Design a protein around this ligand. Structure first.
Ligand SMILES: O=C(O)c1ccc(-c2ccc(OCCCCOc3ccc(Nc4ccccc4C(=O)O)cc3)cc2)cc1
Lengths: 115, 114, 115, 114
């Protein structure tokens, strides 16, 4: 599938499990429209967000709910969430993986784009 | 100086200079209102964004214009911008430094609160 | 298998392919003894370094040959290599993944340890 | 001051204070010879390690004692230490800053050469 998210926890040295992810797509009126959502599995991966057909060209926001993750673990973090904003599929369909590493005061994201 | 932003370039091994940064505060109606802005200096740092008097508790967004930065170097980047969204909290320490490390397909951010 | 390495390239937004990895284990005389080696695949992953039986307790060094990687791409990087040094299997067998993100002047490593 | 080390703690959102750092230079016989050492300050930085006169071209190793740092906070970390190994090269810029970001199971390092 063309959009996947994988999250690691740098404190525990583990997949980040049960991380909620909401994806938005910029609409014609310039608002963020809800596009897809899900949560990471026991492997820290989130599969099945969308399909090739539905994942059209656009500007997408992948919101990773890092505060809700840290608060569900009873930890007080810094950030409200991690925001990944990117233009997708503007040269034809690609497959996008958003990889994230989380600590309470830091996060890091990288994109792996394949054709 | 309660808020400082520092931006580094992981490709060239340098400060990220002349990067535009826009800070917003979340208003009561959930909209982002402009709060402060600037360009990073030769050291990749942006000082003097706000004062202790103006910088009250609440949710702030720091938007870093990474796309223009990369395109000026002739590099096509992945992100439209980098975003850092956080709550400022008078409990605990007073000075927030937001540090960003940039690559064309990656951004990392950490907070140093002292 | 109990020791895996996965590497991403933050410049290209791709797996880091053909990255050489050498693993060492501290011997009784305190020298670094060669233990296993390999290179990342087209997926940026390196599987098959060792076995449960051979991967005994010890202090291991995973050397990721980042300079050779960047130089094979004709790019001049900063670091000679990335070094991951850790005690393994001291509470029983675990499975270790060393995840790395590379840029010419930076690198990042995280460990995912499962039981 | 051609070489500076700065260390940050991603768990607490603070400088990593009183972290021991040992710098070595590679000798002709491939052994690591002591070169300079220190503890990070209250700002998490370590200044005054060397001078331009002593810091000649060659391969250097910066070893950061992250394991003691974490254990003093009551945290069992993954790494025995962090290592940064690099060639110092008079071609191009003169001042090397080695920045490290620490978590118990992760370390990241970037170089800023100006
Ligand atoms: O004050 C100052 O001057 C100053 C200077 C520099 C600073 C830094 C230094 C280093 C970082 O490092 C950035 C974070 C590290 C990169 O993150 C990632 C590491 C590993 C992976 N890997 C994966 C994660 C999930 C799934 C799969 C992978 C994989 O296959 O590799 C992704 C991102 C950030 C800031 C801070 C302050």
């Amino acid at each position: 599938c063309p959009l996947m998210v994988k999250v690691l926890d740098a404190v525990r040295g583990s997949p980040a499990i049960n991380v909620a992810v909401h994806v938005f797509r910029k609409a014609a009126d310039d608002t963020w429209e809800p596009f897809a959502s899900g949560k990471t599995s026991e492997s820290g991966e989130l599969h099945g967000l969308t399909t090739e057909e539905e994942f059209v060209e656009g500007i997408y926001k992948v919101e990773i709910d890092t505060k809700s993750y840290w608060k569900a673990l009873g930890i007080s973090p810094f950030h409200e969430h991690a925001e990944v904003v990117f233009t997708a599929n503007d040269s034809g369909p690609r497959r996008y993986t958003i990889a994230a590493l989380l600590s309470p005061y830091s996060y890091s994201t990288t994109a792996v784009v394949t054709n």
